[PDB]
């Protein structure tokens, strides 16, 4: 229907459109990018604050790069809070990272999926606690 000023009529020769299989996918990809990078209006949006603990494999595993792995997750509405190290066992100390997610954009999916891929440096990803804000 109506989107950006028009709805379906061609008044703009700046867009080539094209009727192609890959083009169709790319047309939709344009909307995905607009919905993701834009449409994010600040309002009373629900948020979750999840405390995950990033546990390293060994002392040799660097704690700062553990934090770096989590802090490089780029999603609009994925906010990082304070992180602290909690010493637990022999050698292994866990990094507790607070993440604040804007629920109407970013689900925990993004953080859960990404940090479990980061398990190349992280031994296991444990959940410390879940809080709503």
From Swiss-Prot:
UniProt subunit comment: EF-1 is composed of 4 subunits: alpha, beta, delta isoform 1, and gamma. Isoform 2 interacts with HSF1 and NFE2L2.
Protein name (Swiss-Prot/TrEMBL): Elongation factor 1-delta
Swiss-Prot/TrEMBL induction comment: By homocysteine (HC), may mediate accelerated synthesis of free thiol-containing proteins in response to HC-induced oxidative stress. Also induced following exposure to ionizing radiation.
Recorded coiled-coil stretches: none
Assigned protein family: Belongs to the EF-1-beta/EF-1-delta family.
Biased composition (Acidic residues): 5-21
Sites bearing Phosphoserine, chain numbering: 14
Region spans: Catalytic (GEF): 25-133
Organism: Homo sapiens
Tissue specificity statement from the Swiss-Prot or TrEMBL entry: Isoform 2 is specifically expressed in brain, cerebellum and testis.
């Amino acid at each position: 229907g109506p989107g950006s000023e028009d709805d379906d009529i061609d008044l703009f020769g700046s867009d080539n459109e094209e009727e192609d299989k890959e083009a169709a996918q790319l047309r939709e990809e344009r909307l995905r990018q607009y919905a993701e990078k834009k449409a994010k209006k600040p309002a009373l949006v629900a948020k979750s604050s999840i405390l995950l603990d990033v546990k390293p494999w060994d002392d040799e595993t660097d704690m700062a790069q553990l934090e770096a792995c989590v802090r490089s997750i780029q999603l609009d509405g994925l906010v990082w809070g304070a992180s602290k190290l909690v010493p637990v066992g022999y050698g292994i100390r866990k990094l507790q990272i607070q993440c604040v997610v804007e629920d109407d954009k970013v689900g925990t999916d993004l953080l859960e999926e990404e940090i479990t891929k980061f398990e190349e440096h992280v031994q296991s990803v444990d959940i410390a606690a879940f809080n709503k804000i």
